[PDB]
């Protein structure tokens, strides 16, 4: 498991970030899910869409200007909030006109305990 395993305490704003390997291709989609299926939030440039039961009050999006890094900060951490977070990059190539997309998924273990 080369992915980092970050640990924090309850109430501390945990910051989880990803850097896309392919910086040349236009970023169409940033995504943050919790395994196995639930989707936490969706990001397109500066705009953010919330799925399931999630709002800006609970989990924020403090990377609106930077595209090379996607970052989520979770405030008021809870043992329920502790889990494995999947962070997804969807690029398309704007150089030519093709149908192939680029997908980059990175996992990160967020462990919260007293």
């Amino acid at each position: 498991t080369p992915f980092p395993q970050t640990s924090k305490k309850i109430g501390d704003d945990a910051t989880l970030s990803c850097n896309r390997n392919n910086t040349n291709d236009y970023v169409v989609m940033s995504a943050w899910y919790k395994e196995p299926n639930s989707i936490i939030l969706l990001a397109a440039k500066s705009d953010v869409l919330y799925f399931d039961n999630y709002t800006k009050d609970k989990i924020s999006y403090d990377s609106p200007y930077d595209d090379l890094v996607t970052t989520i900060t979770i405030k008021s951490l809870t043992a329920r909030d502790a889990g494995t977070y999947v962070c997804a990059f969807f690029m398309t190539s704007t150089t030519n006109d093709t149908d192939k997309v680029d997908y980059e998924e990175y996992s990160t273990e967020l462990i919260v305990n007293t």
């Binding site: 640990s7 200007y65 890094v69």
Partner: protein, 261 residues
Amino acid sequence: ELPKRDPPPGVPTDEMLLNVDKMHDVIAPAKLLEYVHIGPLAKDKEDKVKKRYPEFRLVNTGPGGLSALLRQSYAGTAPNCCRTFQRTHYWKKDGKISDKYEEGAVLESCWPDVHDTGKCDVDLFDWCQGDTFDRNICHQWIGSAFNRADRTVEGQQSLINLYNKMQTLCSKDASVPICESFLHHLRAHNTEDSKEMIDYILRQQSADFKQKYMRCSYPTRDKLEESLKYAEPRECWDPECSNANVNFLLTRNYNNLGLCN
């Protein structure tokens, strides 16, 4: 043939009336992956801003050169950072470190509570082993013995490795001052029953330690019989061991021998 309209005059806010120069008490204290904001920067000065801040990377926040500095590293060297608890950050200049900003000095910050994450247990162990031990720092360095709340795979491994590595030295010869601070902290630092150095090497020590570092606690056979005689005249440190400070007392011998009210 053209309806012209001059744009309204621009009122500049605080978000644009800045320069990274003369902003150093805001850039230096920061955390990882946080966008602390500096004013617009020209393309020529950016390199300088990059050189002064190696842990920071310039990110093009907005138009007109509006950029922020994102911290992705903590380049804190052990012989400078953990040697002094005061230094949250230091500055290099002409090959010398300092605690005050200067023109051209390169910033180097430190991990938060770096002694709580165990980055320095390797270097601090080999620095103040003797002849340079500081009663301030290397005594507070053992505050982590019960304050390590890292709860991380690397951190716990570092803590256990440090425990064993220093237990080797405290087994060879207790007279090391760092080991003295260790047995000072060992009263309740790790739960209440995690101390057994009594029977490993401290069970059989040199005869000089009988007369120099454990006087009435580790006695000879005749003194062993005399110690328990009467009603605790040699139990705890009444007779002559009271003059000797309570530095190296066996933990089992501590509660047992030293319990005089």
